[PDB]
Amino acid sequence: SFEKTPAIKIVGNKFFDSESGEQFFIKGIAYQLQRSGAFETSYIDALADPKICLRDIPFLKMLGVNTLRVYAIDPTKSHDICMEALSAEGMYVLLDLSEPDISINRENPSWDVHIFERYKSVIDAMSSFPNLLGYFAGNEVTNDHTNTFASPFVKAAIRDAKEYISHSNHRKIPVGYSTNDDAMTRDNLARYFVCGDVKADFYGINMYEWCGYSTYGTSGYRERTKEFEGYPIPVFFSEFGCNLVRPRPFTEVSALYGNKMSSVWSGGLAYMYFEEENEYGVVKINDNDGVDILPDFKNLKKEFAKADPKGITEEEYLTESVECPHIAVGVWEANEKLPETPDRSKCACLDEILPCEIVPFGKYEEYFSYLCSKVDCSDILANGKTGEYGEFSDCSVEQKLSLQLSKYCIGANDRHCPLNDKNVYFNLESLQPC
Ligand SMILES: OC[C@H]1O[C@@H](O[C@@H]2[C@@H](O)[C@H](O[C@@H]3[C@@H](O)[C@H](n4cc(COCc5ccccc5)nn4)O[C@H](CO)[C@H]3O)O[C@H](CO)[C@H]2O)[C@H](O)[C@@H](O)[C@@H]1O
Ligand SMILES: OC[C@H]1O[C@@H](O[C@@H]2[C@@H](O)[C@H](O[C@@H]3[C@@H](O)[C@H](O)O[C@H](CO)[C@H]3O)O[C@H](CO)[C@H]2O)[C@H](O)[C@@H](O)[C@@H]1O
């Protein structure tokens, strides 16, 4: 049963409970365990392990949260036990689609079949749960003025995740984005993710401006609130909780759910539940795997308990595309033109028909540098500044390298692929006459 968590929907720039019609405010906390050859995932999935999640939900109940942010799940595992247990306490989940080893690389951005398959796998694993609030299609991909050209790839991912969900039988769970708070890029990022024909469904900011006993005016919260007034999609703090002054008083919570900010922001999520040698936890898991409550816990609890955001209703709220930021060198370099939807069938054709292949199972930079001096690699390049995306730039890195290696076609016709490496092999399927 999911009776205590009706699905949340979006109308305009606010979240609403689909049954009651009351505005939904996120009162959240991040919930994600870390690890301190390859028979286990690098990330830990607490929502796939009942002994972990059922230990912590009682403490999450005491905190008074209605939402968790989860950064990584293992889509091959079941999550029904933990998601139902969360639902029984009225708790929702915001979930990143990416994971540390399968994300849009801000240093070399691509939007390809490998990353898209990850996103699809998470969507298909988690979309049956009414308490899945929303998906993040990226987290702080562009994070300063040197990598703004990564953002078109994130917008493509938003578009394609939304389209995949639309064409599925699933509930149309919204897909948004989580950004950082770099002064020189933040305004352009916010506009970019609602500009043109593709829009984020909601916008999370990882917000650490309020440290210690600050105020609405002095923290920067007032200027942020004025900046986001009239923003066309729901906006909230996807992280908060500056730890400069400890124990964290969390007095930002009073501002966030007060009358000035509650008309603009849809709440936020504290970072985070677990203490991981970083002074950001509200609990520490001891050597006996038990929960030890830390000094921050009582302050966050008291602040969430006192918070009482005066929202509006769905019916009372109900009673011209925005221009993308212009390009300026060294400032904003995200083209409005987005890469195409990654095509698994076209890229799977390369696995079938190419004479020379390379298995995945340092070498990429060396072999791309080598091969792209011998053949034209334009067809696998993707440029988010200029909006030029090669025909096969949506294929996996190994497919891309295999294409260039095959482009063999020297013309010896002797099944000897022109690259010395154990991962290189001649594909016998290429001989069989998409
Ligand atoms: O796309 C982009 C990239 O994404 C990286 O992967 C990120 C990965 O870096 C990110 O890590 C977050 C991480 O960003 C987040 N976090 C929060 C904090 C608190 O920050 C305090 C702080 C705040 C401001 C200033 C100083 C300090 N520190 N880390 O913590 C959670 C849980 O502990 C981590 O899962 O999680 C995302 C979702 O799983 C991944 O997509 C990739 O590794 C990579 O190649 C790819 O360029
Ligand atoms: O500079 C790049 C960096 O920006 C970070 O966001 C900053 C905030 O960290 C900063 O917060 C200040 C507090 O640290 C300080 O104690 O109080 C003052 C107000 O009295 C705060 O301004 O504020 C600036 C301007 O709003 C933000 O840009 C990002 O979190 C980080 O991702 C980025 O690398």
Side-chain angles (χ1 to χ4, degrees), residues 255-333:
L256 181 55
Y257 304 100
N259 294 318
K260 298 184 190 301
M261 296 189 70
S262 66
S263 60
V264 175
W265 304 90
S266 295
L269 306 99
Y271 186 88
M272 75 144 313
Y273 186 73
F274 299 109
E275 176 59 30
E276 299 182 314
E277 308 195 318
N278 58 1
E279 294 74 43
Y280 283 108
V282 299
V283 308
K284 175 64 176 76
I285 305 305
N286 62 46
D287 294 11
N288 209 30
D289 296 303
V291 179
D292 290 342
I293 291 163
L294 301 175
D296 287 3
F297 195 97
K298 69 187 180 296
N299 296 340
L300 186 56
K301 175 174 171 65
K302 193 169 199 298
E303 286 283 343
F304 277 144
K306 201 180 80 186
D308 185 25
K310 278 185 165 178
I312 58 171
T313 58
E314 190 194 335
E315 297 300 328
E316 97 189 79
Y317 183 61
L318 286 159
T319 317
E320 35 60 280
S321 58
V322 37
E323 191 175 313
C324 295
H326 69 272
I327 301 297
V329 173
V331 174
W332 187 254
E333 309 178 323

Coordinates of all heavy atoms in Angstrom, one line a residue, residues 255-333:
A255 N 13.8 30.6 7.6 CA 13.7 31.5 6.5 C 13.1 30.8 5.3 O 12.2 31.3 4.7 CB 15.1 32.0 6.1
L256 N 13.6 29.6 5.0 CA 13.1 28.8 3.8 C 11.6 28.5 3.8 O 11.0 28.7 2.7 CB 13.8 27.5 3.8 CG 13.6 26.5 2.6 CD1 13.7 27.2 1.2 CD2 14.5 25.3 2.7
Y257 N 11.0 28.2 4.9 CA 9.5 27.9 5.0 C 8.7 29.1 5.6 O 7.5 29.0 5.8 CB 9.3 26.7 5.9 CG 10.0 25.5 5.3 CD1 11.2 25.1 5.9 CD2 9.5 24.8 4.2 CE1 11.9 24.0 5.4 CE2 10.2 23.7 3.7 CZ 11.4 23.3 4.3 OH 12.1 22.2 3.8
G258 N 9.4 30.3 5.8 CA 8.7 31.5 6.1 C 8.0 32.1 4.9 O 8.1 31.6 3.8
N259 N 7.2 33.2 5.2 CA 6.3 33.7 4.2 C 6.9 34.3 2.9 O 6.4 34.2 1.8 CB 5.3 34.8 4.8 CG 4.4 34.2 5.9 OD1 3.8 33.1 5.6 ND2 4.2 34.8 7.0
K260 N 8.1 34.9 3.1 CA 8.8 35.5 1.9 C 9.3 34.5 1.0 O 9.2 34.6 -0.2 CB 10.0 36.4 2.4 CG 9.5 37.6 3.3 CD 10.7 38.5 3.6 CE 10.4 39.6 4.6 NZ 9.3 40.5 4.2
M261 N 9.9 33.4 1.5 CA 10.5 32.4 0.7 C 9.6 31.2 0.3 O 9.8 30.6 -0.8 CB 11.7 31.7 1.4 CG 12.9 32.7 1.6 SD 14.4 32.0 2.2 CE 14.9 31.0 0.8
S262 N 8.5 31.0 1.1 CA 7.6 29.9 0.7 C 6.7 30.2 -0.5 O 6.1 29.3 -1.1 CB 6.6 29.6 1.9 OG 5.8 30.7 2.2
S263 N 6.6 31.5 -0.9 CA 5.9 31.8 -2.2 C 6.8 31.5 -3.4 O 6.2 31.4 -4.5 CB 5.5 33.3 -2.1 OG 6.6 34.1 -2.0
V264 N 8.1 31.4 -3.2 CA 9.0 31.2 -4.3 C 9.6 29.8 -4.3 O 9.6 29.1 -5.4 CB 10.2 32.2 -4.3 CG1 11.2 31.9 -5.4 CG2 9.6 33.6 -4.5
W265 N 10.1 29.3 -3.2 CA 10.8 28.0 -3.1 C 9.8 26.9 -2.7 O 8.9 27.2 -1.9 CB 12.0 28.1 -2.1 CG 12.9 29.2 -2.5 CD1 12.9 30.5 -2.0 CD2 14.1 29.1 -3.3 NE1 13.9 31.2 -2.6 CE2 14.7 30.4 -3.3 CE3 14.7 28.1 -4.0 CZ2 15.9 30.7 -4.1 CZ3 15.8 28.3 -4.8 CH2 16.4 29.6 -4.8
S266 N 10.1 25.7 -3.1 CA 9.3 24.5 -2.8 C 10.0 23.7 -1.7 O 9.9 22.5 -1.6 CB 9.1 23.7 -4.0 OG 8.2 24.3 -4.9
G267 N 10.8 24.3 -0.8 CA 11.5 23.7 0.3 C 12.9 23.3 0.0 O 13.6 24.0 -0.8
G268 N 13.4 22.3 0.6 CA 14.8 21.8 0.5 C 15.1 20.6 1.2 O 14.4 20.1 2.1
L269 N 16.3 20.1 1.0 CA 16.8 18.9 1.6 C 18.2 19.1 2.2 O 19.1 19.6 1.6 CB 17.0 17.7 0.6 CG 15.7 17.4 -0.2 CD1 15.7 18.0 -1.6 CD2 15.5 15.9 -0.3
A270 N 18.3 18.8 3.5 CA 19.5 19.0 4.3 C 20.6 17.9 3.8 O 20.2 16.8 3.4 CB 19.3 18.8 5.8
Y271 N 21.8 18.3 3.8 CA 22.9 17.4 3.5 C 23.7 17.2 4.8 O 24.3 18.1 5.2 CB 23.8 18.0 2.4 CG 24.9 17.0 1.9 CD1 24.6 16.0 0.9 CD2 26.1 16.9 2.6 CE1 25.5 15.1 0.6 CE2 27.1 16.0 2.2 CZ 26.8 15.1 1.2 OH 27.7 14.1 0.8
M272 N 23.8 16.0 5.4 CA 23.0 14.8 5.0 C 22.7 13.9 6.2 O 23.1 14.3 7.3 CB 23.7 14.0 3.9 CG 24.9 13.2 4.4 SD 25.1 11.6 3.5 CE 23.5 10.9 3.6
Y273 N 22.1 12.8 6.1 CA 21.9 11.8 7.1 C 23.2 11.3 7.8 O 23.4 11.5 8.9 CB 20.9 10.7 6.7 CG 20.5 9.7 7.7 CD1 19.6 10.1 8.7 CD2 21.1 8.4 7.7 CE1 19.2 9.1 9.7 CE2 20.7 7.5 8.7 CZ 19.8 7.9 9.7 OH 19.4 6.9 10.6
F274 N 23.9 10.5 7.0 CA 25.1 9.8 7.4 C 26.3 10.8 7.6 O 26.6 11.6 6.7 CB 25.5 8.7 6.5 CG 24.5 7.6 6.3 CD1 23.8 7.5 5.1 CD2 24.3 6.7 7.3 CE1 22.8 6.5 5.0 CE2 23.3 5.7 7.2 CZ 22.6 5.6 6.0
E275 N 27.1 10.6 8.7 CA 28.4 11.2 9.0 C 29.4 10.3 8.3 O 29.5 9.2 8.6 CB 28.6 11.4 10.5 CG 30.0 11.9 10.9 CD 30.3 13.3 10.3 OE1 29.3 14.1 10.1 OE2 31.5 13.6 10.1
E276 N 30.2 10.9 7.4 CA 31.3 10.2 6.7 C 32.6 10.9 6.7 O 33.2 11.3 5.7 CB 30.8 9.9 5.3 CG 29.5 9.1 5.2 CD 29.1 8.8 3.8 OE1 29.1 9.8 2.9 OE2 28.8 7.7 3.5
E277 N 33.1 11.2 7.9 CA 34.4 11.9 8.2 C 34.4 13.3 7.5 O 35.5 13.8 7.1 CB 35.6 11.0 7.7 CG 35.5 9.6 8.3 CD 36.9 8.9 8.2 OE1 37.5 9.0 7.1 OE2 37.3 8.3 9.2
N278 N 33.3 13.9 7.4 CA 33.1 15.2 6.6 C 32.3 16.3 7.4 O 32.2 17.4 6.9 CB 32.4 14.9 5.3 CG 31.0 14.3 5.4 OD1 30.6 14.0 6.5 ND2 30.4 14.0 4.3
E279 N 31.9 16.0 8.6 CA 31.1 16.8 9.5 C 29.8 17.4 8.8 O 29.4 18.5 8.9 CB 32.0 18.0 10.0 CG 33.0 17.6 11.0 CD 34.2 16.9 10.4 OE1 34.7 17.3 9.3 OE2 34.7 15.9 10.9
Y280 N 29.2 16.5 8.0 CA 27.9 16.8 7.4 C 26.7 15.9 7.8 O 25.6 16.1 7.5 CB 28.0 16.8 5.8 CG 28.6 18.0 5.2 CD1 29.9 17.9 4.7 CD2 28.0 19.2 5.2 CE1 30.5 19.0 4.1 CE2 28.6 20.3 4.7 CZ 29.8 20.3 4.2 OH 30.4 21.4 3.6
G281 N 27.0 14.9 8.6 CA 26.0 13.9 9.1 C 25.2 14.5 10.3 O 25.7 15.3 11.0
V282 N 24.0 14.0 10.4 CA 23.2 14.1 11.7 C 23.2 12.9 12.5 O 22.8 12.9 13.7 CB 21.8 14.6 11.4 CG1 21.8 16.0 10.7 CG2 20.9 13.6 10.6
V283 N 23.6 11.7 12.0 CA 23.9 10.5 12.7 C 25.2 9.9 12.3 O 25.7 10.2 11.1 CB 22.8 9.4 12.6 CG1 21.4 10.0 12.9 CG2 22.7 8.8 11.2
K284 N 25.8 9.1 13.1 CA 27.0 8.3 12.8 C 26.7 6.8 13.0 O 26.1 6.5 14.1 CB 28.2 8.7 13.7 CG 29.5 7.9 13.5 CD 30.1 8.0 12.2 CE 31.4 7.2 12.1 NZ 31.2 5.7 12.0
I285 N 27.0 6.0 12.0 CA 26.8 4.5 12.2 C 28.1 4.0 12.8 O 29.2 4.0 12.3 CB 26.6 3.8 10.8 CG1 25.4 4.5 10.1 CG2 26.4 2.3 11.0 CD1 24.1 4.5 10.8
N286 N 27.9 3.4 14.0 CA 29.0 2.9 14.8 C 29.6 1.5 14.3 O 29.1 1.0 13.4 CB 28.7 2.9 16.3 CG 27.5 1.9 16.7 OD1 27.4 0.8 16.2 ND2 26.6 2.4 17.5
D287 N 30.6 1.0 15.0 CA 31.2 -0.3 14.7 C 30.2 -1.5 14.8 O 30.4 -2.5 14.2 CB 32.5 -0.5 15.5 CG 33.6 0.4 15.2 OD1 33.4 1.4 14.5 OD2 34.7 0.2 15.7
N288 N 29.2 -1.3 15.7 CA 28.2 -2.3 15.8 C 27.0 -2.1 14.9 O 25.9 -2.7 15.1 CB 27.7 -2.3 17.3 CG 27.2 -3.7 17.8 OD1 27.6 -4.7 17.3 ND2 26.2 -3.7 18.7
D289 N 27.1 -1.3 13.8 CA 26.1 -1.0 12.9 C 24.8 -0.3 13.4 O 23.7 -0.3 12.8 CB 25.8 -2.2 12.0 CG 26.9 -2.6 11.1 OD1 27.5 -1.8 10.3 OD2 27.3 -3.8 11.2
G290 N 24.9 0.3 14.6 CA 23.8 1.0 15.3 C 23.9 2.5 15.0 O 25.0 3.0 14.6
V291 N 22.8 3.2 15.2 CA 22.7 4.6 14.9 C 23.0 5.4 16.1 O 22.3 5.3 17.1 CB 21.3 5.0 14.4 CG1 21.2 6.5 14.1 CG2 21.0 4.2 13.1
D292 N 24.1 6.2 16.1 CA 24.4 7.2 17.1 C 24.0 8.6 16.6 O 24.5 9.1 15.7 CB 25.9 7.2 17.5 CG 26.3 5.9 18.2 OD1 25.4 5.2 18.7 OD2 27.5 5.6 18.2
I293 N 23.1 9.2 17.4 CA 22.6 10.6 17.0 C 23.7 11.6 17.4 O 24.3 11.6 18.5 CB 21.3 10.9 17.8 CG1 20.1 10.0 17.2 CG2 20.9 12.4 17.7 CD1 18.9 9.9 18.1
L294 N 23.9 12.5 16.4 CA 24.9 13.6 16.6 C 24.3 14.9 16.9 O 23.1 15.1 16.8 CB 25.7 13.7 15.3 CG 26.5 12.4 14.9 CD1 27.1 12.6 13.5 CD2 27.5 12.0 15.9
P295 N 25.1 15.9 17.4 CA 24.5 17.2 17.9 C 23.6 18.0 16.9 O 22.7 18.7 17.4 CB 25.7 18.0 18.3 CG 26.7 17.0 18.7 CD 26.5 15.9 17.7
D296 N 23.9 17.9 15.6 CA 23.0 18.5 14.6 C 21.6 18.0 14.6 O 20.7 18.8 14.2 CB 23.6 18.3 13.2 CG 24.9 19.1 12.9 OD1 25.4 19.9 13.8 OD2 25.4 19.0 11.8
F297 N 21.4 16.8 14.9 CA 20.1 16.1 14.8 C 18.9 16.9 15.4 O 17.9 17.1 14.8 CB 20.2 14.7 15.4 CG 19.1 13.8 15.0 CD1 19.2 12.9 14.0 CD2 17.9 13.8 15.7 CE1 18.2 12.0 13.6 CE2 16.8 12.9 15.4 CZ 17.0 12.0 14.3
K298 N 19.1 17.2 16.7 CA 18.1 17.9 17.5 C 17.7 19.3 16.9 O 16.6 19.7 16.9 CB 18.5 18.1 19.0 CG 19.6 19.0 19.2 CD 20.1 18.9 20.7 CE 21.3 19.9 20.9 NZ 22.5 19.5 20.2
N299 N 18.7 20.0 16.3 CA 18.5 21.3 15.7 C 17.7 21.2 14.4 O 16.8 22.0 14.2 CB 19.8 22.0 15.5 CG 20.6 22.3 16.8 OD1 20.0 22.3 17.8 ND2 21.9 22.5 16.6
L300 N 18.0 20.3 13.6 CA 17.3 20.0 12.3 C 15.8 19.6 12.7 O 14.9 20.1 12.0 CB 18.0 19.0 11.4 CG 17.4 18.8 10.1 CD1 17.3 20.1 9.3 CD2 18.2 17.7 9.3
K301 N 15.7 18.7 13.6 CA 14.4 18.2 14.1 C 13.5 19.3 14.6 O 12.4 19.5 14.2 CB 14.6 17.2 15.2 CG 13.3 16.7 15.9 CD 13.6 15.6 16.9 CE 12.3 15.2 17.7 NZ 11.2 14.7 16.9
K302 N 14.1 20.2 15.5 CA 13.3 21.3 16.0 C 12.9 22.3 14.9 O 11.8 22.8 14.9 CB 14.1 22.0 17.1 CG 13.3 23.0 18.0 CD 14.0 23.4 19.2 CE 13.0 24.0 20.3 NZ 12.3 25.2 19.8
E303 N 13.8 22.6 14.0 CA 13.6 23.5 12.9 C 12.5 23.0 11.9 O 11.6 23.8 11.6 CB 14.9 23.9 12.2 CG 15.8 24.8 13.0 CD 15.4 26.2 12.9 OE1 14.5 26.6 12.1 OE2 15.8 27.0 13.8
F304 N 12.6 21.8 11.5 CA 11.5 21.2 10.7 C 10.2 21.1 11.4 O 9.1 21.3 10.7 CB 11.9 19.7 10.2 CG 12.8 19.7 8.9 CD1 13.8 18.7 8.8 CD2 12.6 20.6 7.9 CE1 14.6 18.6 7.7 CE2 13.5 20.5 6.8 CZ 14.4 19.5 6.7
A305 N 10.2 20.8 12.7 CA 8.9 20.8 13.4 C 8.2 22.2 13.5 O 7.0 22.2 13.5 CB 9.2 20.2 14.8
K306 N 9.0 23.2 13.7 CA 8.5 24.6 13.7 C 8.1 25.1 12.4 O 7.2 26.0 12.3 CB 9.6 25.5 14.4 CG 9.0 26.8 14.9 CD 10.1 27.7 15.5 CE 10.9 28.5 14.4 NZ 12.1 29.2 15.0
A307 N 8.7 24.6 11.3 CA 8.4 25.1 9.9 C 7.0 24.7 9.6 O 6.6 23.5 9.7 CB 9.4 24.5 8.9
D308 N 6.2 25.7 9.1 CA 4.8 25.5 8.7 C 4.5 26.4 7.5 O 3.9 27.5 7.6 CB 3.9 25.9 9.9 CG 2.4 25.7 9.7 OD1 2.1 24.8 8.9 OD2 1.6 26.4 10.3
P309 N 5.0 25.9 6.3 CA 4.9 26.8 5.1 C 3.4 27.0 4.6 O 2.7 26.0 4.4 CB 5.7 26.0 4.0 CG 5.7 24.6 4.5 CD 5.7 24.7 6.0
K310 N 3.0 28.2 4.5 CA 1.7 28.6 4.0 C 1.7 28.6 2.5 O 2.0 29.6 1.9 CB 1.2 29.9 4.6 CG 0.6 29.9 6.0 CD 0.1 31.3 6.4 CE -0.8 31.1 7.6 NZ -1.3 32.5 8.1
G311 N 1.3 27.4 1.9 CA 1.2 27.3 0.5 C -0.1 27.7 -0.1 O -0.9 28.4 0.6
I312 N -0.4 27.4 -1.3 CA -1.6 27.6 -2.0 C -2.2 26.3 -2.5 O -1.5 25.2 -2.4 CB -1.5 28.6 -3.2 CG1 -0.5 28.2 -4.2 CG2 -1.1 30.0 -2.6 CD1 -0.5 29.0 -5.5
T313 N -3.4 26.3 -3.0 CA -4.0 25.0 -3.5 C -4.0 25.0 -5.0 O -3.8 26.0 -5.7 CB -5.5 25.0 -3.1 OG1 -6.2 26.1 -3.5 CG2 -5.6 24.9 -1.5
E314 N -4.1 23.8 -5.6 CA -4.1 23.6 -7.0 C -5.1 24.4 -7.8 O -4.8 24.9 -8.9 CB -4.3 22.1 -7.3 CG -4.0 21.6 -8.7 CD -4.5 20.2 -9.1 OE1 -4.6 19.4 -8.1 OE2 -4.8 20.0 -10.2
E315 N -6.3 24.4 -7.3 CA -7.4 25.1 -8.0 C -7.3 26.6 -7.9 O -7.6 27.3 -8.9 CB -8.8 24.7 -7.4 CG -9.2 23.2 -7.5 CD -9.2 22.8 -9.0 OE1 -9.6 23.6 -9.9 OE2 -8.9 21.6 -9.3
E316 N -6.8 27.2 -6.8 CA -6.6 28.6 -6.7 C -5.4 29.1 -7.5 O -5.4 30.3 -7.9 CB -6.6 29.1 -5.2 CG -5.2 29.3 -4.6 CD -5.3 29.5 -3.1 OE1 -5.4 28.5 -2.4 OE2 -5.2 30.6 -2.7
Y317 N -4.4 28.3 -7.7 CA -3.3 28.6 -8.5 C -3.6 28.7 -10.0 O -3.1 29.5 -10.7 CB -2.2 27.6 -8.3 CG -0.9 27.9 -9.1 CD1 -0.2 29.1 -8.9 CD2 -0.4 27.0 -10.0 CE1 1.0 29.4 -9.6 CE2 0.8 27.3 -10.7 CZ 1.5 28.5 -10.5 OH 2.6 28.7 -11.2
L318 N -4.5 27.7 -10.5 CA -4.9 27.7 -11.9 C -5.6 28.9 -12.4 O -5.6 29.2 -13.6 CB -5.7 26.4 -12.2 CG -4.9 25.1 -12.2 CD1 -5.8 23.9 -11.9 CD2 -4.1 24.9 -13.5
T319 N -6.4 29.6 -11.5 CA -7.1 30.8 -11.9 C -6.1 32.0 -12.0 O -5.4 32.3 -11.1 CB -8.2 31.1 -10.9 OG1 -8.9 29.9 -10.5 CG2 -9.2 32.1 -11.5
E320 N 5.7 32.0 -26.5 CA 6.3 32.7 -25.4 C 7.4 31.8 -24.7 O 7.4 31.7 -23.5 CB 5.3 33.3 -24.4 CG 4.0 32.5 -24.1 CD 4.3 31.1 -23.6 OE1 4.7 30.2 -24.4 OE2 4.2 30.9 -22.3
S321 N 8.2 31.2 -25.5 CA 9.4 30.5 -25.0 C 10.5 31.5 -24.5 O 10.7 32.5 -25.2 CB 10.0 29.5 -26.1 OG 10.3 30.3 -27.2
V322 N 11.1 31.2 -23.4 CA 12.1 32.1 -22.9 C 13.4 31.9 -23.7 O 13.8 30.8 -24.0 CB 12.3 31.9 -21.3 CG1 12.2 30.5 -20.8 CG2 13.7 32.5 -20.8
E323 N 14.1 33.0 -23.9 CA 15.3 33.1 -24.7 C 16.5 32.5 -24.0 O 16.7 32.7 -22.8 CB 15.6 34.5 -25.1 CG 16.7 34.7 -26.2 CD 16.9 36.2 -26.6 OE1 15.9 36.9 -26.9 OE2 18.0 36.6 -26.7
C324 N 17.3 31.7 -24.8 CA 18.5 31.1 -24.2 C 19.6 32.2 -24.0 O 19.6 33.1 -24.8 CB 19.0 30.0 -25.1 SG 17.9 28.5 -25.2
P325 N 20.4 32.0 -23.0 CA 21.5 33.0 -22.8 C 22.4 33.1 -24.1 O 22.8 32.0 -24.6 CB 22.3 32.5 -21.6 CG 21.3 31.7 -20.9 CD 20.4 31.1 -21.9
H326 N 22.8 34.3 -24.5 CA 23.7 34.4 -25.6 C 25.1 33.9 -25.3 O 25.5 33.9 -24.1 CB 23.8 35.9 -26.1 CG 24.4 36.8 -25.1 ND1 23.8 37.4 -24.0 CD2 25.7 37.2 -25.0 CE1 24.6 38.2 -23.3 NE2 25.8 38.0 -23.9
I327 N 25.8 33.5 -26.3 CA 27.2 33.0 -26.2 C 28.2 34.1 -26.0 O 28.1 35.1 -26.7 CB 27.6 32.2 -27.4 CG1 26.7 31.0 -27.7 CG2 29.1 31.7 -27.3 CD1 26.6 30.0 -26.6
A328 N 29.1 34.0 -25.0 CA 30.2 34.9 -24.8 C 31.4 34.1 -24.3 O 31.3 33.4 -23.4 CB 29.8 36.0 -23.7
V329 N 32.5 34.3 -25.1 CA 33.7 33.5 -24.8 C 34.2 33.6 -23.4 O 34.3 34.8 -22.9 CB 34.8 33.7 -25.9 CG1 36.1 33.0 -25.5 CG2 34.3 33.4 -27.3
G330 N 34.5 32.5 -22.8 CA 35.0 32.5 -21.4 C 33.9 32.8 -20.3 O 34.3 32.8 -19.1
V331 N 32.7 33.0 -20.7 CA 31.6 33.3 -19.8 C 30.5 32.3 -19.9 O 30.1 31.6 -19.0 CB 31.0 34.7 -20.1 CG1 29.8 35.0 -19.2 CG2 32.1 35.8 -19.8
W332 N 29.9 32.2 -21.1 CA 28.8 31.3 -21.4 C 28.9 30.7 -22.8 O 28.9 31.4 -23.8 CB 27.4 31.9 -21.2 CG 26.3 30.9 -21.3 CD1 25.5 30.7 -22.4 CD2 26.0 29.9 -20.4 NE1 24.6 29.7 -22.1 CE2 24.9 29.2 -20.9 CE3 26.5 29.6 -19.1 CZ2 24.4 28.1 -20.2 CZ3 26.0 28.6 -18.4 CH2 24.9 27.8 -18.9
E333 N 29.1 29.4 -22.8 CA 29.4 28.7 -24.1 C 28.6 27.4 -24.3 O 29.0 26.4 -24.8 CB 30.9 28.3 -24.1 CG 31.9 29.4 -23.7 CD 33.3 29.0 -23.7 OE1 33.6 27.9 -23.2 OE2 34.2 29.8 -24.1

